[PDB]
Amino acid sequence: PHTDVLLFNRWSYDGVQIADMSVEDYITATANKHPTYMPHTAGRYQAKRFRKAQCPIVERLTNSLMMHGRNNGKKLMAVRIIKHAMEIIHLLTDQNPIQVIVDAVINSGPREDATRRQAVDISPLRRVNQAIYLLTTGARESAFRNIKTIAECLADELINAAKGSSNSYAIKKKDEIERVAKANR
Amino acid sequence: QMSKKRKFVADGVFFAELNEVLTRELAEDGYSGVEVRVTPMRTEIIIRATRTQNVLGDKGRRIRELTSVVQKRFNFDENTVELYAEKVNNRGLCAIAQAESLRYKLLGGLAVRRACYGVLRFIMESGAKGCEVIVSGKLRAQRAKSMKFKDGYMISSGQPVKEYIDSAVRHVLLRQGVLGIKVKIMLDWDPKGKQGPTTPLPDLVTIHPPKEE
């Protein structure tokens, strides 16, 4: 389908596809599923279970940038960081930054884990939650005590994760999580 | 001229202090309360007491002494404040009067068990929904304990307590220490608003009987 809503009035939702059956219904980044002009909605997504799966994936990334304590609640800065990162992603990859973000989320979500310890499967929602957490944790760690800016670190983390390369912090952690899970089968 | 905030606080402090002064001056005259009715050109103070003949004195001598000392103490213009004694219509529904009634029985020497049941029985005869008398202190032994005399209905929690419960606390200075008197009287719904609160209990639902016409 087609929509006139463009993210930041810059990026088109047309052509964005989620090529993964498991997490397709838990990533909101397509034209048919409530496209948004900005990743800043004063939404009420914690009122009920599974309700935050409707929150746009770009805004879920923005929320996870408001860490640690020194950055709590500074959402205007977080929206700017993602706005700059998507501009950087377009330059380096020559691709739709929204498409790259969904590819990074799909690739960085672990599909198995250990609990109690024995191997268990991970629900598609927690898989998306873990992917978002891993991507922003890697960008935050590489930016700390570094000349490189947070937007550049986030863009590189997403570009590598979307590519599946091990250079990504989130890809390495996903492999470590799934490596321990297999050891406890 | 003082601001509204301080004036209302100052009026509340005058009522609290006046009640304390009368609570001690008229302790053995059944003092049960006071109403301060400030009006233009005159402030009227109405003293409620079970035994008004002892508050007025011989030919109103004492009520004039109270008026004079009150006017001087509280910086009132002379002949601009009046004191009027009044009688409690239903002495058995006033906890402050029953607490002071129990106080003088204990001071006189009457046994605690007998005195507390006399008050408890009198209050229920006067048309109360319930009553509770608590006496605490060195009753006979060196170690202190509490005796609770309860009868009828009583409530403890919620807004209705403010309207339906009439409570008082008094100290009895006996020879071995201090006894604590607590009288707690639950009133009955009085639509006229005299014997008790006019508003009913929140959980009381009344169905009108249907008519056959």
């Binding site: 009035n9 002009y37 900005m38 004063a42 205007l76 700017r80 706005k83 | -």
Partner: protein, 140 residues
């Protein structure tokens, strides 16, 4: 005098839009809405215009006054007052079916464009510094 005055609310922010028959002016406290601050929240204030299109506003003049709240909540109150003012104007002075059409568009995008958010600050309780947060407990 075909004018309406609709408000929007977000926390303690209140924006009232005075929408009258005009030529398309949109100003907040005398300033054109294209200069809304902060600049990154400018998209949120423009959503009603972007969703419906400027041609829907070509026949009205909107003058907005906003008070209270903060930088973010004032944008949401303004954003809500504009949407309500246009809906109230079409119902009263244009048509019921045109009001039906634009209201469906606004609702399908975001329900807070027309329905206020009831959330408010929870009061602080003693024994802690927040509404929920408690003072740190030590045993030894």
């Amino acid at each position: 005098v075909e004018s309406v005055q609709c408000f929007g609310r977000k926390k303690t922010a209140v924006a009232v839009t005075h929408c009258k028959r005009g030529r398309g002016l949109i100003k907040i406290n005398g300033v054109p809405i294209e200069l809304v601050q902060p600049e990154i929240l400018r998209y949120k204030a423009f959503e009603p215009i972007l969703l419906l299109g400027r041609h829907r506003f070509a026949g009205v003049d909107m003058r907005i006054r906003v008070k209270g709240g903060g930088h973010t909540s004032q944008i949401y109150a303004i954003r809500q007052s504009i949407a309500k003012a246009l809906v109230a104007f079409y119902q009263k002075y244009v048509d019921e079916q045109q009001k039906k059409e634009i209201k469906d568009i606004l609702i399908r995008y975001d329900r807070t464009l027309l329905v206020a958010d009831p959330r408010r600050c929870e009061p602080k309780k003693f024994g802690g510094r927040g509404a929920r947060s408690r003072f740190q407990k030590s045993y030894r």
